[PDB]
Design a protein around this ligand. Structure first.
Ligand code: FPS
Ligand code: MG
Length: 236
């Protein structure tokens, strides 16, 4: 890797857990259990190489359409993940955050995530950001409602709204936009993930199923990224 060109923010759509379990004739939930474990491997190598922000698409606002047993299983995984992995996150100076409407989660999931946010609040290393009950359209609808009330309550009209103002009112207001979006499994679509924020992101559509995505594969993705020529509408 070119150590002077490590992306500051990588966003990942963790797809393929269902297919990984079906290949093995195991229930879909087994693939999610293995996919929650794979998050630990990726957090480790992202922190070690000096990625500043890692946003993981854990559950979207459309994923409520899935069978309730699968929804409840995914919603409970964070409790398991933080129970075993929080000590290492503290030690590795990782700061845990979320984006999404995290109020709709099971109480025990809220408590486990809040405890992890509080225990890592002053950490200055990798920001590990879980997008849980998150969708880019719903994020915009919510930010729009906030902006409409803030402007009226400040005695402002809408002439002050520009792209920068919207950036500062999204759930990602404290993060830069990701340079790189990786999606596993093969699919080639963004499925409502960070739709405003990925306007100029590089995409990589990696063919491994999420539970098979490992350190080596993350490094190969960053190497691919470093070969991309980004133009932002201009000439190279
Ligand atoms: C955030 C946290 C600490 C733990 C939660 C971690 C996990 C595993 C969340 C499930 C992630 C999802 C919805 C993956 C889509 S794989 P898919 O079901 O779409 O697979 P398929 O397309 O059917 O192969
Ligand atoms: Mg899928």
């Amino acid at each position: 890797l070119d150590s002077s060109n490590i992306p500051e923010h990588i966003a990942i759509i963790m797809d393929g857990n269902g297919r990984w379990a079906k290949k093995r004739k195991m229930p879909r939930i087994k693939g999610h259990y293995e996919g929650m474990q794979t998050i630990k491997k990726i957090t480790r190598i992202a922190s070690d190489i000096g990625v500043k922000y890692l946003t993981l698409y854990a559950f979207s606002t459309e994923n409520w359409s899935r069978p309730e047993s699968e929804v409840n299983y995914i919603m409970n995984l964070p409790v398991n993940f933080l129970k075993t992995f929080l000590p290492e996150l503290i030690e590795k100076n990782v700061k845990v955050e979320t984006i999404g409407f995290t109020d709709k989660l099971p109480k025990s999931t809220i408590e486990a995530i809040n405890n992890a946010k509080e225990k890592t609040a002053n950490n200055t290393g990798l920001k590990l950001i879980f997008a849980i009950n998150y969708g880019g359209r719903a994020e915009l609808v919510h930010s729009i409602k906030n902006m409409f009330d803030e402007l009226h309550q400040q005695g402002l009209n809408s002439d002050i709204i520009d792209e920068t103002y919207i950036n500062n009112h999204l759930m990602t207001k404290d993060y830069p936009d990701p340079e790189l979006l990786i999606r596993t499994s093969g699919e080639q679509r963004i499925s409502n993930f960070l739709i405003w924020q990925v306007s100029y992101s590089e995409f990589i559509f990696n063919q491994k199923l999420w539970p098979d995505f490992d350190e080596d594969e993350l490094i190969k993705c960053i190497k691919i990224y470093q070969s991309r020529q980004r133009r932002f509408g201009g000439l190279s």
